[PDB]
Design a protein around this ligand. Structure first.
Ligand code: NI
Ligand code: NI
Ligand code: NI
Ligand code: NI
Ligand code: OH
Ligand code: OH
Lengths: 100, 570, 122, 570, 100, 100
């Protein structure tokens, strides 16, 4: 596979997102690390799909809403940042105030 | 008996006139010459040539022209040439490039390249071998950054920092004698070569100079500490006395001066201009004009490399978030718009292609990617071939001229700029055996094996519980060169002459090899290999248009790069 | 324009191995009951005793085959092989201890070969 | 007052006549004797016996017959016996096997096994305790291999290599003075005992001998360096002068000789024959006949152990892939068919059972599994019991004779072969405290705790954030014996007498305990514990049929093994 | 659980295979590490199922075809190797030219 | 996400449980580490759901039965222990003799 350090770490984010999505599916309001994991994995999968940085800056604000998460979680998350390989190489995505 | 060229290349790697594609780019390198004697190629294994009384000499002791290590059948890509040879290593240094084996029975054996009882073998047939990368813009923020760098073929980190302190997160600075001593001690555990920059700021000499005497290898002038005429002047006075290099991140804000004021303070003295395009920092909007001057050693950092369709959206947002800027404050938007410029990023691609920007670097964890200096060098060369065509200087349909111009940007040129090219930066006899093996399909993407001081430090290798080393999962792992006390012998701490004369290594108990920084103040643009062009760079203050020889330098951003989604899991 | 990452585009032509060296063809027989495989760079006179051939014609020579390859003799198999000349100093040390010096000492090599039962010393 | 035997065994572990199943095998070990005094068993905890004025003596200083560590109620499985005892450790060594506690109030206390203020306690009730495994066929290719070995109860690695260099990937060789020095320094960071082999190749003595003087503990003769009569002869001349062992991987190709030629070169001198069955290397097809000779110390490597329905398909393909052989080149297929032989692999199972092959080993990462030497020893013994029945020598329906024959193959016999059995290889007074605790349900599969020099180095233990150490995830982890400078005191670097006399440890700054290799040249097959059989082994050159005492040795491959899918997640 | 080093590492391969299978399910042509992960996990699960080494050498050539992967990926993968616990203990599987 | 050491380790348990559940779904009798992983992940997810320690001590005995696992596995597992964040903070759950 030739995994580099980042590829090994970022597998963890996908895994945490899968865990969080199972928790959301059985009706739980998600907590801070769950919410971050879901939005982060969404960004990385969007890059893999060939979306633009601008598309993901927009979409990342609509992945989870206030009623998906515990009290205070929207106000705990100011930004979520991820780097992923786009068709044009690694780029940084910052999603500001992802959950209003 | 004759061997067809396809079978020859499959068995021994390519020979004279054969071409190899670099990863999934459209860049081809051609073998210029070959040191072998056809029929007496070295190789190792069952019934192979390097066996006692045959290609291995059974007579000579280690001191008697015998190698510690022979890399067989390497395709060397270096500023010195693209050619086929055996590489001999002894005492951690490259001692021979030529033909290894046994003079008893083989023709053409390079006299100090005997394979003897003492010799280890690395098969490099079908591999590209380069010098280790020299990254001269490293922020020491997160120790996990070292493996990131090794995985992309970097073997030397020059920069500064104390970990994730704000001064270090912004600037390549280890400030003052105490922080320098602490980070020299930390460096004893980092499996890579290191040189530390002190703070290039002050209005009196002694506060700056004491950092050099404490063990710094150079200085960094950064606007976040005040890139004032005084700080520039004192730092260069110190550097000229101490024989170390000064890196500059100039006054973006133009607060105390414009570019011409910074050049006047420099006063013709040698300086390394970091992220010279300016997205990573410097006089808005015209800093990149530095790269035209004969006393400037100009480098790029990597996130602008090369110009892609996501670059501007990514950089404008990154700058706003990092600097805590607000989209609804017009001064904040004006600042960002003055600093992130498609006109200068597009021109930066072309200035690299023309040999006007001499060096690449990361800006690791401050505004750049620790593991993408080599990656983005080759993506830039590939884009320039697609958009500008083969360079005029090419022949035989090969990209050898471009390949030597670009490999120089992250190997020999940073080493020359830093005063360390006597030790590192190229595959030459007498230099430290920092070598990177690449499978051509992974060239510039993921290193196969990283050799540090003649011992493998890092490798893409598989299941440690398996019968053989290739089963999954194959991933980057630290090798025996990083373990126990061998980390001391396989890595260099680069230090100022004065700190070495004053016994700082003994005082701090440093066990690493100590490298001397020297011959940094005599050099200029003319000393940058394949990247020695001086010219008047005009940057239009209204349009940000870059002109060289009366021609606008512009190119389009690309939607796709090679060395990207075919290779990476994320 | 299909891209095979890291592919070769080899030049035209062929590589001649051991160019300019004398070639010699000889018949060799594996008189033993187990297989014998012989590498490209072993001093040919010093191979396995049970290989029967004119041992004198192996002195100062090795197989004229690509570097790192080998010739195989199944039990009882006789076949022709082509030899080329050793190069460099034309000295051999160790292996079967038949030479330990210049390959020019044919008399001495054959005397040692005969005393130790290397088949085919005339 | 009387305790029924079921309750007694549940509380204190088994006693005389009780049997314990080894993992999920059909092998049973029986307690032969017990050093306790019934009613005065040692134990530790709330209201338990090892408390001040009770089973813990409150009078004596550490020097006064007091232990640093008592392992209570151990079921010892060793070549010396299968029996119940307390094990006392002091200064990193086993100082007492017997009965620990307080002579103030207890009967039968072994006089130097006082539990005092200075004494740590490990509860071994219900555990099997063995010596650490001695692996004498290690390729140093990937440092991740050390934890793999520790997890399966291996505590000593003998072999060679410099990391994933081709010479090291093929051969257990650290070549020449410089590579040896570098790997002795690397060894300072490896949490296991180590001895390094030099290259057993040359036609002059000095190139070989300088490796012994540089700090090698032995030599490896390998066909990939030329396993010629000269290299064999010079290596054994060096070994006889230096008192170190020579391992051989003979000339598979029969290029310079057949087996009888290799034996003539050996000339009755002591040698360790690696992977003696020959799939891992050696004269095709008859190398395994070496194991009949009195001057041969014969070992197996582990992938042929034992003969299973997937073995041949797996080995034929592995050999073709490794050697870059083609299925459509008849010489390549003939070579593979000559080397991978069901006839010799089946016979190898039986030769182990008969005590004709004396040792196991891994061939870690070259053609063998770093963490499966112990595992496959017990799978072989289990298969042989199923196919051949209890051995004649057994009694009481126990498998004690087989269990001592097989435990000897990976503990005491490799230590004797290497000249290190004065330090390691068995649970005996005066030897280094390298001890492995096993839950019987995991016996030979996953070690509970690995003690190195009297401190736990490796353990199966859980969540480090939990209230107690047992919550999930329970996984193999390095313990405090591996941390900081304690890695120096808990591990031995084994070296030649000459390198020790010449001060190599001081020259290289080695802080590990230094072990002397000695008494390697005087020994033979007769010195292999429970595995001392010499006999004429006939291997038919046409059919590959193995005969001993006129009888064909053959057995069937099995479709299933114990110590396999019940235990492993992959 | 008593995880040894290899069991911990090989969990990563299963995870990377799950990630890659999700990418294939939403219509992406797979890249080099994705393809390797899928075929590797297939081999390890096949061992767990009790298939023979010979069955997996055959099946591993039919898990992904050329039209499942990006241009050049078939020619990048010469071999995929995995060790797993079969009913008869650990064995090595090599799948040659898994994707024609 | 701000993962601490335990959060990173415990992601592995969830992953091993997902692997084991896939093996059970295709009809395999589960082995020792598989069974432990499934029951452990069940406990940790139950805490996340807001069950009590007492509820999980009961439920953990009914997750897998003897006919879900290989011969001897029930007798190999005396206890399974897990710590997880309940609504009232970290607590220890011990499930005794989970598989009769
Ligand atoms: Ni900067
Ligand atoms: Ni910077
Ligand atoms: Ni071998
Ligand atoms: Ni080996
Ligand atoms: O920067
Ligand atoms: O081997």
């Amino acid at each position: 596979m030739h995994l580099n350090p980042a590829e090994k770490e970022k597998l963890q984010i996908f895994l945490a997102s899968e865990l969080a999505l199972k928790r959301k599916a059985r009706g739980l309001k998600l907590n801070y690390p769950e919410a971050v994991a879901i939005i982060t994995s969404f960004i990385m999968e969007g890059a893999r799909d060939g979306k633009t940085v601008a598309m993901l800056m927009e979409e990342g604000k609509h992945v989870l809403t206030r009623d998906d998460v515990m009290e205070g979680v929207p106000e705990m998350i100011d930004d979520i940042q991820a780097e992923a390989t786009f068709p044009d190489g690694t780029k940084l995505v910052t999603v500001h105030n992802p959950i209003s | 008996m004759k061997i067809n060229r396809q079978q020859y290349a499959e068995s021994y790697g390519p020979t004279v006139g054969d071409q190899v594609r670099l990863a999934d780019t459209d860049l081809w390198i051609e073998v210029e010459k070959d040191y072998t004697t056809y029929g007496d190629e070295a190789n190792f294994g069952g019934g192979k040539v390097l066996r006692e009384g045959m290609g291995e000499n059974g007579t000579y002791t280690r001191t008697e022209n015998v190698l510690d290590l022979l890399l067989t059948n390497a395709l060397i890509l270096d500023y010195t040439g693209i050619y086929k040879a055996d590489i001999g290593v002894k005492d951690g240094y490259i001692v021979g490039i030529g033909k290894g084996g046994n003079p008893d029975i083989m023709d053409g054996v390079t006299p100090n390249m005997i394979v003897g009882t003492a010799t280890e073998v690395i098969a490099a047939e079908g591999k590209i071998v380069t010098a280790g990368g020299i990254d001269t813009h490293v922020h020491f923020i997160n120790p996990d950054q070292v493996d990131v760098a090794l995985a992309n073929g970097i073997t030397t980190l020059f920069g500064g920092g104390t970990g994730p302190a704000e001064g270090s997160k912004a600037t390549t600075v280890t400030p003052g004698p105490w922080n320098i001593e602490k980070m020299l001690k930390s460096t004893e555990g980092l499996p890579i070569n290191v040189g530390i920059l002190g703070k290039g700021h002050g209005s009196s000499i002694a506060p700056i100079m004491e950092q050099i005497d404490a063990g710094a290898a150079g200085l960094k002038i950064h606007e976040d500490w005040g890139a004032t005429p005084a700080s520039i002047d004192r730092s260069l006075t110190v550097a000229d006395e101490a024989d170390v290099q000064v890196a500059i991140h100039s006054d973006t804000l133009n607060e105390a001066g414009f570019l011409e004021d910074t050049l006047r303070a420099i006063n013709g003295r040698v300086i390394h201009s970091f992220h010279v395009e300016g997205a990573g920092g410097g006089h808005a909007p015209d800093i990149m004009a530095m790269a035209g001057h004969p006393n400037v050693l100009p480098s790029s950092t990597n996130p602008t490399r090369p110009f892609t369709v996501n670059t501007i959206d990514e950089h404008l947002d990154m700058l706003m978030v990092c600097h805590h800027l607000k989209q609804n404050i017009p001064e904040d938007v004006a600042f960002a718009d003055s600093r992130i410029r498609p006109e200068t990023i597009a021109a930066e691609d072309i200035l690299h292609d023309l040999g006007i920007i001499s060096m690449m670097s990361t800006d690791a964890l401050a505004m750049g990617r620790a593991g993408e200096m080599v990656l983005r060098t080759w993506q830039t060369a590939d884009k320039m071939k697609k958009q500008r065509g083969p360079l005029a200087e090419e022949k035989n349909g090969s990209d050898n001229f471009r390949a030597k111009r670009y490999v120089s940007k992250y190997t020999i040129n940073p080493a020359i700029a830093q005063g360390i090219a006597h030790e590192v930066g190229s595959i030459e006899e007498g230099k430290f055996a920092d070598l990177v093996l690449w499978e051509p399909k992974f060239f510039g993407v993921k290193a196969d094996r990283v050799i540090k001081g003649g011992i493998i430090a890092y490798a893409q290798i598989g299941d440690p519980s398996a019968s053989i080393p290739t089963p999954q999962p194959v991933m980057g792992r630290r090798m025996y060169g990083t373990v126990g006390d061998l980390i001391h012998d396989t890595n260099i701490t680069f230090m100022s002459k004065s700190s070495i004369q004053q016994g700082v290594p003994a005082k701090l108990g440093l066990k690493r090899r100590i490298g001397t920084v020297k011959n940094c103040r005599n050099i200029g643009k003319k000393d940058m290999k394949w990247n020695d062009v001086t010219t008047d760079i005009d940057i239009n203050p209204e349009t940000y248009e870059v002109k060289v020889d009366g021609e606008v330098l512009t190119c389009e951003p690309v939607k796709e790069l090679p060395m990207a989604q075919r290779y990476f899991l994320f | 324009n299909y891209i095979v990452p890291g592919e070769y585009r080899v030049a035209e032509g062929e590589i001649e191995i051991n160019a300019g060296r004398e070639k010699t063809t000889i018949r060799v027989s594996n008189t033993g009951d187990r297989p014998i495989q012989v590498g490209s760079h072993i001093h040919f006179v010093e191979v396995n005793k049970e290989l029967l051939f004119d041992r004198a014609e192996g002195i100062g020579r090795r197989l004229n085959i690509p570097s790192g390859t080998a010739a195989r003799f199944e039990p009882g198999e006789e076949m022709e092989v082509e030899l080329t000349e050793l190069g460099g100093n034309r000295e051999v040390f160790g292996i079967s201890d038949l030479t330990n010096g210049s390959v020019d000492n044919k008399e001495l090599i054959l005397q040692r070969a005969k005393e130790l039962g290397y088949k085919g010393v005339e």
